Amino acid sequence: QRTVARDITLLECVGKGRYGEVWRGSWQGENVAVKIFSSRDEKSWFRETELYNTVMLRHENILGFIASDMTSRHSSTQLWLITHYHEMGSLYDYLQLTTLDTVSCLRIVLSIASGLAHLHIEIFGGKPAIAHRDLKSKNILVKKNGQCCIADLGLAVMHRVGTKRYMAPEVLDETIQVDCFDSYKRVDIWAFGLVLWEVARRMVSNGIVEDYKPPFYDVVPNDPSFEDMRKVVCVDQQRPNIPNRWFSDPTLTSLAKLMKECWYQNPSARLTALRIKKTLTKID
Numbered sequence: 001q002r003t004v005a006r007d008i009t010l011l012e013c014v015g016k017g018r019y020g021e022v023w024r025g026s027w028q029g030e031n032v033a034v035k036i037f038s039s040r041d042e043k044s045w046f047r048e049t050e051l052y053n054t055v056m057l058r059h060e061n062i063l064g065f066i067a068s069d070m071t072s073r074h075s076s077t078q079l080w081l082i083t084h085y086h087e088m089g090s091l092y093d094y095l096q097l098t099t100l101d102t103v104s105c106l107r108i109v110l111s112i113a114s115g116l117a118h119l120h121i122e123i124f125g126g127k128p129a130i131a132h133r134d135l136k137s138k139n140i141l142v143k144k145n146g147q148c149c150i151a152d153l154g155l156a157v158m159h160r161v162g163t164k165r166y167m168a169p170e171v172l173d174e175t176i177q178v179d180c181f182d183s184y185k186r187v188d189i190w191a192f193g194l195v196l197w198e199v200a201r202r203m204v205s206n207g208i209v210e211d212y213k214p215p216f217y218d219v220v221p222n223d224p225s226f227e228d229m230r231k232v233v234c235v236d237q238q239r240p241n242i243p244n245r246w247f248s249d250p251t252l253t254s255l256a257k258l259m260k261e262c263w264y265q266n267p268s269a270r271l272t273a274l275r276i277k278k279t280l281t282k283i284d
């Protein structure tokens with residue numbers, strides 16, 4: 001009746017970490033990305049699979065799902081997540097290789113806000129509301145058309161802990177209202193503000209740009225502890241630096257105000273993803 005072509009040729013490893021690997025693969029002449037999970041992070045494969053079994057997300061700023069595969073091995077289970085392949089790689093990667101102009105900076109950040117608002121929104125008749133819980137520049141991919149897409153729904157919640165450097169104050173001080181779905185959207189907005197800061201630094205104005213740095217590069221070590229981050233974010237209430245040169249540029253002046261309104265200590269004071277999108281459409 002029909003041939004079901006399931007062979008994927010794994011061609012090159014494009015990412016490796018504690019808890020698995022991503023490969024560029026080929027299926028029927030087409031590039032795909034294959035994430036192979038460590039057994040120690042099996043729950044991330046299960047959570048992303050359970051979410052996509054609930055709602056087949058389809059959005060230009062969400063990494064495109066193709067398949068979840070479980071294969072029996074003699075004394076283990078092999079878990080693969082197969083998605084669209086973005087040859088430009090992660091935003092984290094990209095910001096070290098390039099500087100940005102005004103149009104390219106705004107296009108990047110509005111595309112991220114668009115993907116995030118799509119996750120956050122409940123649609124009736126539709127999708128549940130979804131919070132990401134690990135938003136960061138390594139979890140955003142750059143597309144050839146200059147927009148980005150959000151990746152990794154292994155920690156997502158529908159209505160493992162997040163990367164410590166990007167944790168909101170209420171996560172670090174353990175006050176977060178864990179029974180309130182809105183709490184998790186507000187944690188994503190905090191992380192979005194940090195990403196917005198990372199990108200804005202690489203936008204040129206008046207011949208000036210900042211070097212790529214991660215959030216809090218100047219106040220915490222590499223692989224910062226929970227306590228390192230709690231002291232910076234909660235006890236001292238530090239926030240990333242806004243350089244003086246941004247205040248000569250109307251785009252970076254507006255982006256500075258936006259990122260401040262993602263970083264309030266009080267989670268309910270933070271902007272929503274939809275309000276961030278509106279603000280970004282009125283900049284320039």
Ligand SMILES: COc1cc(-c2cncc(-c3ccc(C4CCN(C)CC4)cc3)c2C)cc(OC)c1OC
Nearest residue numbers: 002003004005006007008027032066067068069082
């Ligand atoms: C199982 O595993 C994998 C399968 C595939 C794949 C390969 N050819 C064809 C298919 C296909 C799709 C859809 C239908 C429909 C046709 C309409 N009818 C009313 C209902 C059924 C049939 C067949 C698939 C899904 C790719 C894979 O990798 C990319 C797979 O491994 C993850």
Ligand SMILES: COc1cc(-c2cncc(-c3ccc(C4CCN(C)CC4)cc3)c2C)cc(OC)c1OC
Nearest residue numbers: 003004005027028030031032065066067082083084
């Ligand atoms: C998983 O991913 C890929 C899958 C395929 C693919 C292979 N065979 C068959 C299909 C298919 C055919 C027909 C229906 C039906 C559904 C109900 N009704 C009857 C109208 C249409 C659904 C599915 C697909 C989608 C191609 C892909 O790329 C070209 C995939 O992407 C990697």
Ligand SMILES: COc1cc(-c2cncc(-c3ccc(C4CCN(C)CC4)cc3)c2C)cc(OC)c1OC
Nearest residue numbers: 014015022033034035083085086089090139151152
């Ligand atoms: C974050 O999370 C996921 C990401 C991806 C993913 C999708 N497209 C492309 C990539 C990629 C390709 C190429 C490079 C680099 C390497 C070599 N060179 C120096 C520059 C280019 C980097 C990254 C990835 C990693 C897939 C995933 O799942 C299948 C992910 O997990 C959900």
